Structures are given as structure tokens and as C-alpha cells.
Motif scaffolding. Structure first.
Motif, short mmCIF file in Angstrom:
data_model
loop_
_atom_site.label_atom_id
_atom_site.label_comp_id
_atom_site.label_asym_id
_atom_site.label_seq_id
_atom_site.Cartn_x
_atom_site.Cartn_y
_atom_site.Cartn_z
N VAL A 286 0.84 -1.20 0.00
CA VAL A 286 0.00 0.00 0.00
C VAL A 286 0.87 1.25 0.00
CG1 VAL A 286 -1.97 1.13 1.16
CG2 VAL A 286 -1.70 -1.35 1.24
N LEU A 287 2.07 1.16 0.56
CA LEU A 287 2.95 2.31 0.52
C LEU A 287 3.61 2.50 -0.83
CD1 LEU A 287 4.48 2.30 3.97
CD2 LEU A 287 3.05 3.99 2.93
N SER A 288 4.00 1.42 -1.49
CA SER A 288 4.65 1.57 -2.79
C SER A 288 3.63 1.87 -3.89
CB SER A 288 5.49 0.34 -3.10
OG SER A 288 6.60 0.28 -2.23
N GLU A 289 2.39 1.43 -3.70
CA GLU A 289 1.30 1.91 -4.55
C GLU A 289 1.03 3.39 -4.33
OE1 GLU A 289 -1.91 -0.60 -3.42
OE2 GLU A 289 -1.47 -2.15 -4.90
N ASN A 290 0.78 3.77 -3.08
CA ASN A 290 0.44 5.14 -2.72
C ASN A 290 1.46 5.65 -1.71
OD1 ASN A 290 -1.87 5.59 -4.37
ND2 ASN A 290 -3.11 4.39 -2.93
N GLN A 291 2.56 6.24 -2.19
CA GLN A 291 2.82 6.41 -3.61
C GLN A 291 4.15 5.88 -4.03
OE1 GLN A 291 2.49 10.48 -4.79
NE2 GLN A 291 0.27 10.45 -5.02
N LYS A 292 4.37 5.97 -5.34
CA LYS A 292 5.71 5.95 -5.91
C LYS A 292 6.32 7.34 -5.72
CE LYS A 292 4.30 2.53 -9.30
NZ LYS A 292 2.87 2.53 -8.91
N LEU A 293 7.37 7.63 -6.49
CA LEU A 293 8.13 8.89 -6.44
C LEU A 293 8.67 9.10 -5.02
CD1 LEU A 293 5.52 10.81 -8.61
CD2 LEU A 293 7.40 9.36 -9.41
N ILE A 294 9.07 7.98 -4.41
CA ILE A 294 10.28 7.14 -4.61
C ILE A 294 11.15 7.13 -5.87
CG2 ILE A 294 10.94 4.71 -4.44
CD1 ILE A 294 8.47 4.19 -2.88
#
Lengths: 131, 45, 62, 49
Positions: A123-131
């Protein structure tokens, strides 16, 4: 021989979307490798242009004396090993065994590599990227 | 005599697909086994 | 003896719990089969599947 | 030679070392089940391996 073994992506100008990778070969000795070969100060080597080039004027070929042998591999080919290694970063970094795999895009390889030990789940890498 | 071969590399490059599917290179045969390295442990004393 | 086959990355349906992987990938096609590293290919999974959260490229499930 | 004895049972593991006596064949079907992650249907059908 304990580097390559298997299996590249291969090197396409788009590795990961959108991870700007400098490690692409521009074309043969990629860009970051070009930085750490230009900034390092080597007065050597000579392979049928540097002997004559020093003759136009280090002295591994003039005292003789000492003599430097070439490093078993042309630079394009060491570049070929590490470039297929950059190809295998994404799929081999999955894993599930070394090495019998794969072709997965580099972005998803860093969302699973990032899902792993920085154990932030999906859920964190989905929301969000940008990373 | 008969110099100059350039025999590299060459890994069996699986190709990267585009969409939600992504190709993968699983094998078929086991083919085990090798002898491997000596690790020296001592001297003669 | 390397044979290039196709993933996902998992599965979903009308309801969305997922699969993939215990521990090796995919989930091939013909139809969705799973002997992975090394040889191929298994049956319907039934113990070859943890059930993580859904991801993009919806319903199968990349 | 006691190390070759402990190959089978110690290669199980589940801790080093507080174990075991398992035959060597089953030790290589679990060692083979592990990282060459081919599960049980391949090592059943077949062996020879």
C-alpha cells in the motif's frame, strides 16, 4: 565466470519506469564507468597506439626492464559481463533461485526488493511511488 | 598458430516483455554435480 | 535446458484476494500452472500460494 | 566419517546441532526440495535423479 552465467534482459535504453539509470551503455563501458575512468588518473596504457604515442614524445615499454601485461579481457568485454549483470539485476533479484530466471522490469524489481527488507508492503509503494 | 579468437560471452538472454506478463527462463534438466575446491587449512609443520 | 514461458505475478477475481508465490514464479499460462525452479509445470495450486495484497494491472494481478 | 554420518540428519536441520538420523536419500530429497525448489511431485515422479 562466477559473474555472468545467466541471463540478461537485454540492455534496452529503458530499464525501469521511471528510474533514470546512468548504468546504460551508450554505444562498451557505460556512463558511470566512464566517470570513474575519466576522473581516475592513469598515465598508462599502450596497446599499439600508446607505445608509438609515447615514442612521439609509463615506461613499461622503454626500460624493458619491467613490462606490464594486458588484463586478459578487452574493456568492451568486461563491459559485456557487467552489462549482462545489469540485465540480470532485475530478474535475478527476485530470486527465487540462483540462477534459473528471469525477465522482470527493473521498477517491479525494486518494488519487490523494496518490499522485502524495507518491509513496507504494497500500500505504501502503490500510494505512492516517487520514490 | 591460428591465433586471435574472441569467445565471449554469451548468456542465454531471455527477452523482456512489456505488459502485465513477464517472461522467465525456467529449465528442464537437473544434471548435477562437480568436484570443487581445496581449502588448505594448514601447513606442513 | 532453458524454456522461456510467461508469468503473472498472481491472480484475482471479482473478489480480490491474491496468490503468488510459494515461492517461485509464476503462475504460468496453460492454464495457470506452477512447477517453477527448476522444472515445469504443476496443477492447481492449493498450497503454492500465500495471499498478499492486490497490485496493479488488475484482476491477474501484476 | 562422523561428518559424513551427520550429513544426512544434520542436513535437515532444524538446528545445529541437536539432531538426527534420517536416511541419506530423504536428505537429498529435502535438500533438493529446498533450493532447487522442485516440490514433491517431481521427486516422486520421478527419481533417477
Amino acid at each position: 565466470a562466477s559473474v555472468k552465467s545467466s541471463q540478461s534482459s537485454p540492455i534496452i535504453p529503458g530499464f525501469g519506469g521511471d528510474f533514470n539509470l546512468t548504468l546504460l551503455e551508450p554505444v562498451a563501458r557505460s556512463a558511470i564507468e566512464d566517470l570513474l575512468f575519466d576522473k581516475v588518473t592513469i598515465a598508462d596504457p599502450g596497446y599499439m597506439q600508446g607505445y608509438d604515442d609515447c615514442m612521439q614524445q609509463i615506461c613499461a615499454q622503454y626500460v624493458a626492464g619491467y613490462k606490464v601485461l594486458p588484463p586478459l579481457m578487452d574493456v568492451n568485454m568486461e563491459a559485456a559481463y557487467t552489462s549482462s549483470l545489469l540485465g540480470s539485476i532485475a530478474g535475478v533479484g527476485w530470486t527465487a533461485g540462483l540462477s534459473s530466471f528471469a525477465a522482470i522490469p527493473f521498477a517491479q524489481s525494486i518494488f519487490y526488493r523494496l518490499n522485502g527488507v524495507g518491509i513496507t508492503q504494497q500500500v505504501l509503494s502503490e500510494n505512492q511511488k516517487l520514490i | 598458430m591460428r591465433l586471435a579468437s574472441i569467445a565471449f560471452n554469451h548468456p542465454i538472454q531471455v527477452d523482456q516483455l512489456n505488459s502485465s506478463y513477464f517472461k522467465l527462463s525456467i529449465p528442464t534438466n537437473f544434471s548435477f554435480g562437480v568436484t570443487q575446491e581445496y581449502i588448505q587449512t594448514t601447513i606442513q609443520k | 535446458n532453458h524454456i522461456e514461458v510467461v508469468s503473472a505475478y498472481g491472480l484475482c477475481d471479482a473478489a480480490n484476494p491474491t496468490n503468488c508465490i510459494a515461492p517461485v514464479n509464476g503462475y504460468f499460462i496453460k492454464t495457470n500452472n506452477t512447477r517453477i525452479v527448476d522444472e515445469w509445470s504443476y496443477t492447481g495450486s492449493s498450497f503454492y500460494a500465500p495471499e498478499p495484497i492486490t497490485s496493479l494491472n488488475t484482476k491477474y494481478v501484476a
